[PDB]
Amino acid sequence: GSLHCPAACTCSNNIVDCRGKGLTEIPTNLPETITEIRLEQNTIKVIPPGAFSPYKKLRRIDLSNNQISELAPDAFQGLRSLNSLVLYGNKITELPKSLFEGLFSLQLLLLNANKINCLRVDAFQDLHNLNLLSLYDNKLQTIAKGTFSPLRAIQTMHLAQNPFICDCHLKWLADYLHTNPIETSGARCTSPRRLANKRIGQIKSKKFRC
């Protein structure tokens, strides 16, 4: 074969480690057999169309602590073995339609420490094996009813450090969190005044009103 390991990285037993190398883009032409790609602590701004799609044996993608402000909707298209996706410590404001489509194997999804201001009701449509979801420290004021319905295997969720508006549209979440005590970071209402600084889990569902 020809060489498929970027000089900035090390490639050991199909683990490609590119951490802390001042990279601004994902290296292209990686080994087709790659199971883990480690890009944390670089300066990547954009995840381009079909970025990871060629790498069918990928189990772990780590892009934490980059400067990511945009991801292409098909960045993870056609990955059926992906187990863990870590995206924390970036500048992500929205997740395009279909971003996590087909990630049936996904077990860990770290989206904490971004600027996510909205989630689509279909955001986790295919994530039936997801065990841990971290949305901690984002800009969510609400989560639409039904967003967690696909999450059949969920064990742990972090929702805190989001400016939640605890009105009638978040009532379902109070219900959800009372029936499923899996939110461990202390999700709190920012408004209305009556509920300010109160854990969503501590508030009776009736108090969520428009």
Binding site: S12, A113, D137, T156
Partner: protein, 107 residues
């Protein structure tokens, strides 16, 4: 064809030094090979680190990869449970492997 026999643990990824700020997330990694799959324990200054897997009440999780995940670094004027020097230890019935040190420092 190519059989995998049981073998004792070997650290293939050591935790690496990390600088982080109060309130920010942090991960120290620890990848061990071995069969049966090694179990991972973390030590800070030689003292065993409590995680969700020892207490479900926690900002620290031990992930299935062996990584120690801090959802947010705690660093107050007079309370600093996270900063320190960490080692991971991987064990199975055939032996153990101890990682290099890794410093977790708060800027």
């Amino acid at each position: 064809s190519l059989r995998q026999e049981d073998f004792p643990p070997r650290i293939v990824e050591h935790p690496s030094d990390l600088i982080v700020s109060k309130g920010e997330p942090a991960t120290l990694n620890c990848k061990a090979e071995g069969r049966p799959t090694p179990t991972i324990e973390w030590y800070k200054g030689g003292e065993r680190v409590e995680t969700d897997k020892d207490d479900p009440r926690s900002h620290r999780m031990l992930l299935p990869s062996g990584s120690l995940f801090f959802l947010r670094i705690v660093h107050g004027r007079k309370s600093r449970p996270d900063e320190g020097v960490y080692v991971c230890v991987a064990r199975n019935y055939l032996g153990e492997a101890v990682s290099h040190d890794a410093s977790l420092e708060v800027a």
